[PDB]
Design a binder for this molecule. Structure first.
Ligand code: HEM
Length: 154
């Protein structure tokens, strides 16, 4: 699958807004993920102890990870499809070290879409959400292909 330039423009336009507050968006997205699919939290030995949303919001450690995650995702999105080099190490660490099922990657995509829709309604209408979903599906498809090559189900 390939996104059109018009689709990439919609994706990068809303991403530019996300970049005005990377730490805040990182926090919102991770918390959304954990609240919607609590089982994902078990994969983070570093955050498994957090019991409430209040504790998550206060964790400087969780905020730091959110920044790291969004910065990596941003670098990938800006490649507009030419992300093979950036994807390799990420696929390897998540398949071999962290052991993240492809199913959890879908939950992740859901969380990002929910937060963008909540914080940027004006720049995240139907067309823009469709473009973002397509970009995230592209990423998931490529990561899934790499998982297989690396010897991990998904
Ligand atoms: C767009 C998808 C995602 C991106 C871009 C992303 C990115 C990253 C990055 C950059 C790191 C640090 C470097 C590394 O270890 O490779 C990381 C670590 C990690 N990721 Fe992801 N990640 C994604 C999805 C997920 C999901 C869905 C889970 C599980 C629900 C997950 C679990 C982990 C874990 C357990 C670590 C280690 C955290 C620590 O202990 O410091 N990641 N991820």
């Amino acid at each position: 699958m390939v996104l059109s330039e018009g689709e990439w423009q919609l994706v990068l336009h809303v991403w530019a807004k996300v970049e005005a507050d990377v730490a805040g968006h990182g926090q919102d997205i991770l918390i959304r993920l954990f609240k919607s699919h609590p089982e994902t939290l078990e994969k983070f030995d570093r955050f498994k102890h957090l019991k409430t949303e209040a504790e998550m919001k206060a964790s400087e450690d969780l905020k730091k990870h959110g920044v790291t995650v969004l910065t990596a995702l941003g670098a990938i999105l800006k490649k507009k499809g030419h992300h093979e080099a950036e994807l390799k190490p990420l696929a390897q660490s998540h398949a071999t070290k962290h052991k993240i099922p492809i199913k959890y990657l879908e939950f992740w995509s859901e969380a990002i879409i929910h937060v963008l829709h909540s914080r940027h309604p004006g720049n995240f209408g139907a067309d823009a959400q469709g473009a973002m979903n397509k970009a995230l599906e592209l990423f998931r498809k490529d990561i899934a292909a790499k998982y297989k090559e690396l010897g991990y189900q998904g």
